[PDB]
């Protein structure tokens, strides 16, 4: 049934204060290896 009268963005009522960081931590296992500049720090 095509419903054009209900707001479908209802998930954001359930978000806590640690939702974004936990989502990043769960996503971090799918990421590429980061390129390196050849040094630990610019002050190194």
């Amino acid at each position: 049934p095509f419903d054009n009268t209900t707001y479908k963005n209802l998930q954001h009522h359930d978000y806590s204060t640690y939702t974004f960081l936990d989502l990043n931590l769960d996503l971090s296992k799918f990421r590429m290896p980061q390129p390196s500049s050849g040094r630990e720090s610019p002050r190194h």
């Binding site: 963005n9 960081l21 630990e40």
Partner: protein, 213 residues
């Protein structure tokens, strides 16, 4: 609004602060999100993470963030003083921010302001005696078609009248969580006099794809 720090027993470098181990794992993920050799970028999220440990920043999270990322503490002080979303003073549990820019001023956000001030018995920048509310005045928060609007913690309460913000305050005092949405009939951004556009159902895939693709 003082940008210099004086050492107090409440806010001293020997104030106890340390991240939880789950926050250590989150900090490690934040650091791994950035290129090697540029760990200092992780100053921006992790310090905010420290705020989510306390709700405010004493000068012990700044030194800890500087220590775990090999940056001088003055850079962390610069980051914490440049941005306005980092609380360097102990704010209440429910931090209320009222937008009073011109697209919100035209729709009478000052009415919301005096209603909140009359209800809570406090002024702008003043904390409640029971440390439950803290009312300040901020700039535009990017929901100007839903004017007037306020932000409580990380939630947006938009298109309010004085009655709705009174109801929101009484619901916050009771311990319940109100729904972060507009208090009028509309949901997100549609006109109140019915949907003027986007009434047609979506076409779906394969529509308008040019040849040779």
């Amino acid at each position: 609004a003082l940008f210099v720090h004086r050492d107090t027993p409440k806010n001293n470098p020997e104030t106890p602060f340390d991240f939880t181990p789950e926050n250590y794992k989150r900090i490690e993920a934040i650091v791994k999100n950035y290129p090697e050799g540029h760990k200092a970028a992780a100053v921006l999220p992790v310090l905010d993470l420290a705020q989510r440990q306390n709700g405010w920043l004493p000068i012990s999270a700044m030194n800890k963030v500087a220590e775990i990322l090999q940056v001088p503490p003055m850079r962390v002080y610069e980051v914490a003083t440049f941005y306005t979303m980092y609380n360097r003073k102990p704010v209440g549990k429910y931090h209320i921010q009222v937008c009073t820019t011109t697209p919100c001023m035209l729709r009478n956000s000052d009415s919301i302001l005096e209603a909140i001030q009359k209800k809570l018995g406090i002024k702008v920048g003043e904390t409640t005696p029971d440390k439950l509310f803290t009312l300040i005045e901020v700039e535009c928060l990017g929901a100007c078609v839903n004017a007037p609007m306020v932000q409580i913690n990380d939630n947006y309460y938009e298109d309010l009248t004085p009655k709705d913000i009174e109801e929101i305050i009484d619901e916050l005092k009771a311990g319940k969580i109100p729904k972060p949405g507009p208090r009028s009939g509309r949901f997100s951004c549609e006109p109140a006099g019915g949907l003027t556009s986007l009434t047609e159902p979506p076409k779906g895939p394969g529509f308008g794809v040019q040849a040779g693709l």
